[PDB]
């Protein structure tokens, strides 16, 4: 198989969702994950993940720890190969201008990445974590939160988040 049928379908979905499918990006990510995972137990330690983040993206230690905590939903103290691949695809050279539109497109559900609690609601801590992950002004984030909170309860539903993402994508395309 071409590195499992599930990952093949994920690569096909990424190619259908992105203008450029690159060349062996998933293979390079798998090679980097194999290099990071010393024991080759399909998992990586927090220290190894922070070392890889400092070597590649040169992110802060607190930001790397927050990203690892958000990615590892199992809370087992380790990050899997699939989690590392998902994080790499979410980053996708975030310094580029088109990476902002790629992150606005996000993924198929495009809600659970922001909703760390998982109760179909994104809080102020989740908004701050998203603003730490992707650079954005605090005033702009507050204005976006106020615009999204139509009911004034400071809670974002899945349909409201989808509508906001669609409006942002339409504004960016136009």
């Amino acid at each position: 198989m071409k590195l499992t049928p599930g990952c093949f379908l994920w690569y096909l979905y990424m190619d259908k969702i992105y203008c450029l499918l690159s060349l062996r990006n998933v293979k390079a990510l798998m090679v980097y994950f194999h290099l990071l995972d010393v024991h080759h137990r399909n998992t990586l330690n927090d220290v190894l993940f922070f070392h890889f983040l400092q070597h590649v993206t040169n992110l802060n230690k607190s930001q790397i720890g927050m990203i690892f905590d958000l990615l590892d939903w199992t809370a087992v103290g380790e990050i899997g190969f699939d989690q590392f691949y998902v994080l790499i695809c979410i980053l996708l050279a975030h310094q580029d201008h088109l990476e902002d539109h790629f992150m606005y497109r996000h993924s198929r559900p495009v809600f659970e990445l922001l909703d760390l609690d998982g109760e179909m609601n994104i809080g102020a801590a989740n908004f701050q974590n998203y603003r730490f992950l992707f650079n954005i002004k605090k005033q702009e984030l507050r204005d976006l939160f106020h615009d999204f909170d139509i009911t004034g309860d400071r809670l974002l539903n899945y349909k409201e988040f989808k509508l906001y993402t669609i409006f942002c994508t339409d504004k960016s395309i136009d």
Partner: protein
């Protein structure tokens, strides 16, 4: 007791209408900003269609 009750909900009924008017003004501003956004989007769509027709 009559003085305290009279004052209590005289001020309650005074600020209730004030807060309702302030929330109505905020809702009017929100509706107007949504209308401006919609008109801007429609103008952008029409301009894109005109450019595609003329190109």
């Amino acid at each position: 007791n009559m003085f305290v009750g009279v004052m209590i909900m005289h001020t309650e009924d005074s600020m209730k209408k004030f807060e309702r008017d302030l929330t109505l003004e905020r809702n009017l501003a929100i509706m107007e900003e949504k209308q401006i956004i919609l008109k801007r989007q429609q103008e952008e769509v029409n301009r894109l269609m005109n450019t595609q027709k003329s190109g």
